[PDB]
Amino acid sequence: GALFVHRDTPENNPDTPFDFTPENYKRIEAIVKNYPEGHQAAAVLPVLDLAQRQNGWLPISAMNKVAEVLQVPPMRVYEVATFYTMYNRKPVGKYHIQVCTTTPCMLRDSDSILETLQRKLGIKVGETTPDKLFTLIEVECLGACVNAPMVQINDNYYEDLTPKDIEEIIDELKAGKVPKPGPRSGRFCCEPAGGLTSLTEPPKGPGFGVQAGL
Amino acid sequence: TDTTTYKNLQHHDYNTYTFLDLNLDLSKFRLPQPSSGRESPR
Amino acid sequence: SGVNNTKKWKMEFDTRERWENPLMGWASTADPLSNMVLTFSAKEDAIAFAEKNGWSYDVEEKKVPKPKSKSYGANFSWNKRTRVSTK
Amino acid sequence: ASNLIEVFVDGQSVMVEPGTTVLQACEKVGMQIPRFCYHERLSVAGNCRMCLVEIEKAPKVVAACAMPVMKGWNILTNSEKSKKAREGVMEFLLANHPLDCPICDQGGECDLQDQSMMFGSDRSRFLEGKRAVEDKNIGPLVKTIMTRCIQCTRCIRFASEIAGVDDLGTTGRGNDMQVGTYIEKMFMSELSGNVIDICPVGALTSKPYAFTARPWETRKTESIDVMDAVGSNIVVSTRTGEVMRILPRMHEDINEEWISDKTR
Amino acid sequence: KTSFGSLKDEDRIFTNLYGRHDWRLKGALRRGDWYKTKEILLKGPDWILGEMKTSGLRGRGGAGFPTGLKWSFMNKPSDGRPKYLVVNADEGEPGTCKDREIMRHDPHKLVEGCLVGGRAMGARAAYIYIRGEFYNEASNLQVAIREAYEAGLIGKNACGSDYDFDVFVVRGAGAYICGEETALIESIEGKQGKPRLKPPFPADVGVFGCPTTVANVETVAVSPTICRRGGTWFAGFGRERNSGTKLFNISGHVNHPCTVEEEMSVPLKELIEKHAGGVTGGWDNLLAVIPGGSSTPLIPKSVCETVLMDFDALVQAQTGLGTAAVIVMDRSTDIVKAIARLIEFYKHESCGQCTPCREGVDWMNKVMARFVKGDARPAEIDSLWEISKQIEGHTICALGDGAAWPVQGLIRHFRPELEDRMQRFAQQHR
Ligand SMILES: Cc1cc2nc3c(=O)[nH]c(=O)nc-3n(C[C@H](O)[C@H](O)[C@H](O)COP(=O)(O)O)c2cc1C
Ligand code: SF4
Ligand code: SF4
Ligand code: SF4
Ligand code: FES
Ligand code: FES
Ligand SMILES: [K+]
Known part of the structure; x- marks a missing residue:
């Protein structure tokens, strides 16, 4: 896939304009204050994530800016950004669709979801639409396995997907409205479909079954 | 005591800065951090 | 990192002239006592051989590595400078 | 025996300081545990996994470069488990090591070549293409x-x-x-x-x-x-x-x- | 008791698993959270550790190590350093959603468990390392934490018990290896997520070099209910040495893929057609089950007929109970494709620090790709078995073991399938 080396380009040279907004600087100060004194170098991942959330992707200038803000080596910053997969070292679209193709999602047939996304967006996996609105990649497990098949778009989880359902999700994204995340098969969450096999009775409440002497 | 309706809808209107802004808001409730005896490990 | 070549004492000779052959440029020499080394189990055995054969000797003491205090927990120290920034 | 502990290597007793590693005890008794990432003047990393040895009454091999001996351990350096671990680690290395020995400046000064000849296997089960x-x-x-x-x-x-x-x-x-x-x-x-x-x-x-x-x-x-x-x-x-x-x-x-x- | 299962709703701990009730502080107080927490903390550390030991609760992470002993490892006087409780909410394992569900729909139990465990060990802070993809879950956890801070349950007076406690939430960036204990510790410390060797154990050297303890979200969340209702009740549920409730995530080829909370030692069959709605096509259509997440090997139907869901029962069945992820595969499943996809997942998620896992798991990914294609010969099955046995037990963390185990299970059980595939490829080629 991607290459874990850097090449200077006119869009990703170490002179591209990046700087934190003052509210982002306040958030960085909050993260550093959360971490201990003398171990404030542990704030590399949240500050890098904040830089990514500000700028979209993470240029080499943003990496160097995070390094000089945290007084941590730029090589350590590069190590973090290249080890971890949620940091985009290349520009991506406005909507970054991640399709989980791990084994239970494959069992619940996420391959149809992947091929219908490829046909609908007119692109292959790992590439961006020419209008820079959609990037489509395969990923590993995203933590919602009983809700297979599923995608993640930006920070939002779309679950119990049929090809028709992911088509309306893409249509809503193209129209510009919020696609109302969650499962799309009529069930609310991970509960069993067609009835509730547990937790039918109301919860008992405080002071239930408490032992003596407490 | 409604049980037939999903009531987690508060996570639907969450922007890209919700976690960081709430951390910044909550930062005034924390205890002072311990000191490692140095500004940095150098 | 192997240390098996540092177990036996060795006797060598002083190096002499190795000039250049006019014909081929080979390394030509004039001493016979250059390409030889002798192995010994003990420093005093090597010294005894040298004094028996009548050669003036320079003896160098055995350089053994000093024992080191190695600990994997020093790489993650709370306050010391031994904490590493990477792995 | 004040500020000293007794540990056995191949049934041979030796006295070491607390915090002394298994590799340090083995070089104290006079044998060299195979190593690729350990250096006696660098910090302990313990990732190459070549220094795995078997302790008696212990079903898990331990890395000699990182594990400290505690008390009365028996370090079976030439055991079957240790030999199998060394063979597996070296064949894992040589699976994707490039086939570059004649064009290599590390011709006879190669720890990989040497220790491969010394402890590793002599053949390849790698039927795939190497990485570059x-x-x-x-x-x-x-x-x-x-x-x-x-x-x-x-x-x-x-x-x-x-x-x-x-x-x-x-x-x-x-x-x-x-x-x-x-x-x-x-x-x-x-x-x-x-x-x-x-x-x-x-x-x-x-x-x-x-x-x-x-x-x-x-x-x-x-x-x-x-x-x-x-x-x-x-x-x-x-x-x-x-x-x-x-x-x-x-x-x-x-x-x-x-x-x-x-x-x- | 002899036959297990049929857990009662009043004895179920996670009363808001499906999110049908309010997950905020009002809903938690209605459901019974944060009750007599000050009394718990005034009872103090030794009483809570004794409650855990009488509970016999084991790690829900998949390690299976006794929670009481693991939390009593930090029952020591301080050496001038702080002590930390760390919660693992990474949920990397495929097939599993239970920690995500309980954090999203019931986070005040998690916060109360962080407080209870921190008081039990003796600690000033609990760092909850959540997966980076769980942005909404992390935000909901942060909302609950702010509610607890405003209500005074956390911070400078832990429910008025004169105990200073902090709860931090730190987000990862998508690493199954950062799901691991020590690699999680390094991820919190800010380095790239490579596990560190043991010793030093985290009870001596953890995050920032301080004595820490990494614990699962499910274990931490069932900690305060265990303390409130007693350890004898939790020990009475379940079998001997496998006691209490457990969140099972049943997924794959089942009619209702769902997360349920059920008593331990339930039969796998009874679990499947009691909560999953049965296998798609039926129990005769069932082919294989991975019962304890993708780090555990597969088991066929003939041993799935009467296998229990215990740690010891699955060990006797040559498997393990990990994060209780029951992945079900029917007769139409390409089983070699499923296992090869799992090995590809392990290749993509290995951190690459140590040579056996790095090189060998890449090698096994390539070999199982050729196995799915059929492009091998039957000696390579034994070669792959030897490669898996060389990986297992020679790595730094247990990701190498968790990658070698599914191939070991596939070779042990579905070996005629592989031989038939190679024979089919050979007869079609020439
Ligand atoms: C490679 C690897 C990944 C793991 N990922 C997770 C994870 O995402 N979540 C988790 O709770 N445990 C995970 N574990 C298990 C941890 O060891 C366990 O959570 C931790 O030690 C806490 O112990 P406990 O189970 O007693 O709570 C993982 C283990 C390994 C070897
Ligand atoms: S093999 Fe050489 S280049 Fe590679 S990590 Fe070791 S010292 Fe560095
Ligand atoms: S001589 Fe050593 S380093 Fe060079 S190619 Fe051969 S095995 Fe590799
Ligand atoms: S076993 Fe794999 S994931 Fe674990 S330390 Fe080794 S390379 Fe990393
Ligand atoms: S396997 Fe796809 S979300 Fe877990
Ligand atoms: S010498 Fe590399 S693991 Fe010990
Ligand atoms: K070299």
Whole structure:
């Protein structure tokens, strides 16, 4: 896939304009204050994530800016950004669709979801639409396995997907409205479909079954 | 005591800065951090 | 990192002239006592051989590595400078 | 036996300090545990997994470079479990090690070749294609052929702890993890030839010495460096009456195991 | 008791698993959270550790190590350093959603468990390392934490018990290896997520070099209910040495893929057609089950007929109970494709620090790719078995073991399938 080396380009040279907004600087100060004194170098991942959330992707200038803000080596910053997969070292679209193709999602047939996304967006996996609105990649497990098949778009989880359902999700994204995340098969969450096999009775409440002497 | 309706809808209107802004808001409730005896490990 | 070549004492000779052959440029020499080394189990055995054969000797003491205090927990120290920034 | 503990190696008793590793106990009794990432002057990393040995009444092999002996352990260094672990680790290394021995500057000075002949198997079960890594340009002193790298982090630990530059590191994950600099950075500092010294494979070679001679060709002459006034002990390697290379010497009171770049 | 299962709703701990009730502080107080927490903390550390030991609760992470002993490892006087409780909410394992569900729909139990465990060990802070993809879950956890801070349950007076406690939430960036204990510790410390060797154990050297303890979200969340209702009740549920409730995530080829909370030692069959709605096509259509997440090997139907869901029962069945992820595969499943996809996942998620896992798991990914294609010969099955046995037990963390185990299970059980595939490829080629 991607290459874990850097090449200077006119869009990703170490002179591209990046700087934190003052509210982002306040958030960085909050993260550093959360971490201990003398171990404030542990704030590399949240500050890098904040830089990514500000700028979209993470240029080499943003990496160097995070390094000089945290007084941590730029090589350590590069190590973090290249080890971890949620940091985009290349520009991506406005909507970054991640399709989980791990084994239970494959069992619940996420391959149809992947091929219908490829046909609908007119692109292959790992590439961006020419209008820079959609990037489509395969990923590993995203933590919602009983809700297979599923995608993640930006920070939002779309679950119990049929090809028709992911088509309306893409249509809503193209129209510009919020696609109302969650499962799309009529069930609310991970509960069993067609009835509730547990937790039918109301919860008992405080002071239930408490032992003596407490 | 409604049980037939999903009531987690508060996570639907969450922007890209919700976690960081709430951390910044909550930062005034924390205890002072311990000191490692140095500004940095150098 | 192997240390098996540092177990036996060795006797060598002083190096002499190795000039250049006019014909081929080979390394030509004039001493016979250059390409030889002798192995010994003990420093005093090597010294005894040298004094028996009548050669003036320079003896160098055995350089053994000093024992080191190695600990994997020093790489993650709370306050010391031994904490590493990477792995 | 005050401030001392008794530990057995192959049934032989020895007295060691607390905190002494299994590898340190083995070199105390007189044998050398195989190693690729451990260096006695670098921090303990414990990733190459070559130093796995079997302790008696223990079903899990332990890394000798990191595990400290506690009390009365029996270190079975030449056991069947230890031999199988060494064979597996070496064949895992040589699965993706490139097939570059004749064109390699680490011809006879190869710990990988040596320890492979000594402990590893003699054949390959690898029926796949090897991985290839693009080469870096960290400077005209150190030539980098990073396909040969086995990712032991010796150079990274050396640059972090002794050179103190924090310029080298591991970028990536899994089999695609690459040792070097993320950007095109010139790795020039003091003591920058010692990465060529301590790299066990021929990944970090010497550019002036490149493709010149072989260790069996070179004659070793013990001498003293005079470029500065520290008086560091060196080995001058000369082949056919011509100086070919400068190497350090182990002298703990002067220069330990390293020499300056001007010296080298 | 002899036959297990049929857990009662009043004895179920996670009363808001499906999110049908309010997850905020009002809903938590209605459901019974944060009750007599000050009394718990005034009872103090030794009483809570004794409650855990009488509970016999084991790690829900998949390690299976006794929670009481693991939390009593930090029952020591301080050496001038702080002590930390760390919660693992990474949920990397495929097939598993239970920690995500309980954090999203019931986070005040998690916060109360952080407080209870921190008081039990003796600690000033609990760092909850959540997966980076769980942005909404992390935000909901942060909302609950702010509610607890405003209500005074956390911070400078832990429910008025004169105990200073902090709860931090730190987000990862998508690493199954950062799901691991020590690699999680390094991820919190800010380095790239490579596990560190043991010793030093985290009870001596953890995050920032301080004595820490990494614990699962499910274990931490069932901690305060265990303390409130007693350890004898939790020990009475379940079998001997496998006691209490457990969140099972049943997914794959089942009619209702769901997360349920059920008593331990339930039969796998009874679990499947009691909560999953049965296998798609039926129990005769069932082919294989991975019962304890993708680090555990597969088991066929003939041993799935009467296998229990215990740690010891699955060990006797040559498997393990990990994060209780029951992945079900029917007769139409390409089983070799499923296992090869799992090995590809492990290749993509290995951190690459140590040579056996790095090189060998890449090798096994390539070999199982050729196995799916059929492009091998039957000696390579034994070669792959030897490669897996060389990986297992020679790595730094247990990711190498968790990658070698599914191939070991596939070779042990579905070996005629592989031989038939190679024979089919050979007869079609020539
Ligand atoms: C490679 C690897 C990944 C793991 N990922 C997770 C994870 O995402 N979540 C988790 O709770 N445990 C995970 N574990 C298990 C941890 O060891 C366990 O959570 C931790 O030690 C806490 O112990 P406990 O189970 O007693 O709570 C993982 C283990 C390994 C070897
Ligand atoms: S470093 Fe590799 S290519 Fe070079 S001699 Fe050693 S084994 Fe051969
Ligand atoms: S370049 Fe050499 S010293 Fe550095 S990690 Fe690779 S093999 Fe080790
Ligand atoms: S077993 Fe794999 S994931 Fe674990 S330390 Fe080794 S390379 Fe990393
Ligand atoms: S396997 Fe796809 S979300 Fe877990
Ligand atoms: S020498 Fe111990 S693991 Fe490398
Ligand atoms: K070298």
